[PDB]
From a paper:
[name] and [name]-10 are TGF-β family signaling ligands naturally secreted into blood. They act on endothelial cells and are required for proper development and maintenance of the vasculature. [name] and −10 are synthesized as pro-proteins and processed by furin to release growth factors comprised of two cystine-knotted protomers that can covalently homo- or hetero-dimerize via a single cysteine in the dimer interface. Unlike other ligands of the TGF-β family, [name] and −10 are secreted as a mixture of disulfide-linked dimers and monomers, in which the interchain cysteine (Cys-392) remains either paired or unpaired.
Author numbering:
A (entry chain A), B (entry chain A): 325 to 429
Write the structure that this text describes.
């Protein structure tokens, strides 16, 4: 039940972006889900700060929060978008749209 | 009430590291606290994925979690630690120990 990449299919209409994104209608964004708690998994690539904070959280759970399972690497997708001239234009690498890797931070 | 760096003073004894860290006894680790919710602040440097996920969370709050306020840059501290030869040694830049910057991820 540890920090990992899971599916997350996003509809641009649902998030109000269909005003400018023509296509695609949906994409696989993924998400990072799971706990950052001891014992850790081999590949959650935990920073020292995440480790320290997790230990502090254990000792003081009402005052300090645990580390968070977040994207640590993102990948691009292509989008067809409306130009200011009102013309569909391809944005070939629209960066930061999809999770490549997750970790505790 | 947005994502930012706040104080977090860590005692190494409290987290079980006084077995190997001789000094210092405590340090300022900081932590990242606050919400990742619209409207965003100017300097939470949000990735596109964090923005998309936050919007999906709004539409589907029981199924998708919000973005997380995490460290996006860390700084070193110096520690005096016990060597395998049982001798105090300085580790001048012990990396990743203190928060330099926070953001939504
Ligand atoms: Cl562990
Ligand atoms: Cl680190
Ligand atoms: Cl491009
Ligand atoms: Cl290419
Ligand atoms: Cl881009
Ligand atoms: Cl905003
Ligand atoms: Cl981005
Ligand atoms: Cl060093
Ligand atoms: Cl130096
Ligand atoms: Cl180091
Ligand atoms: Na997957
Ligand atoms: Na959606
Ligand atoms: Na507490
Ligand atoms: Na290519
Ligand atoms: Na501060
Ligand atoms: Na402490
Ligand atoms: Na829901
Ligand atoms: Na120096």
């Amino acid at each position: 039940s540890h920090c990992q990449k899971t599916s997350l299919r996003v509809n641009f209409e649902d998030i109000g972006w269909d005003s400018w994104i023509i296509a695609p209608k949906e994409y696989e964004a993924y998400e990072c889900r799971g706990g950052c708690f001891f014992p850790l998994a081999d590949d959650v690539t935990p920073t020292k700060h995440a480790i320290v904070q997790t230990l502090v959280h254990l000792k003081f759970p009402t005052k300090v929060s645990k580390a968070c399972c977040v994207p640590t690497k993102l990948s691009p997708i292509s989008v067809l978008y409306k130009d200011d001239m009102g013309v569909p234009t391809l944005k070939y690498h629209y960066e930061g749209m999809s999770v490549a890797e997750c970790g505790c931070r």
